[PDB]
Amino acid sequence: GEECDCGSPSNPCCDAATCKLRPGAQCADGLCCDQCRFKKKRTICRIARGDFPDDRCTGQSADCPRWN
Numbered sequence: 001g002e003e004c005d006c007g008s009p010s011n012p013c014c015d016a017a018t019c020k021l022r023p024g025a026q027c028a029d030g031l032c033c034d035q036c037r038f039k040k041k042r043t044i045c046r047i048a049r050g051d052f053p054d055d056r057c058t059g060q061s062a063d064c065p066r067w068n
Contacts, residue, residue: 012036030062038062 004019006028013028013036014021027033031045039045041059048054053067 027062031064032057033062 002019004014005021006014006019009016009019011028012022013025015023021028021036025036026038027036032039032043038059038061039057041057043057043059044054045057045064046055048067055064055067058065
C-alpha cells in the first residue's frame with residue numbers, strides 16, 4: 001500500500017507517480033493549506049463557538065490549531 005498525501009489523483013499538490021507531495025508543496029489539504037502552501041500566520045481558520053478567540057494559522061502547518 002501507499003500512504004498518499006492527496007486523496008484525489010487530480011490534486012496538483014502531489015506527484016502523480018508517487019501520490020505524495022511534489023517538490024514545492026508543503027501540504028495538500030487542511031484549513032491552513034492554500035495552493036499547496038501553508039497559509040500565512042494569523043490567518044483566521046476557525047470561528048470559535050461562544051466568546052472565545054477565533055483560531056488562526058501558525059504559518060508552519062496545514063491544520064488549524066485550537067487557541068490555548
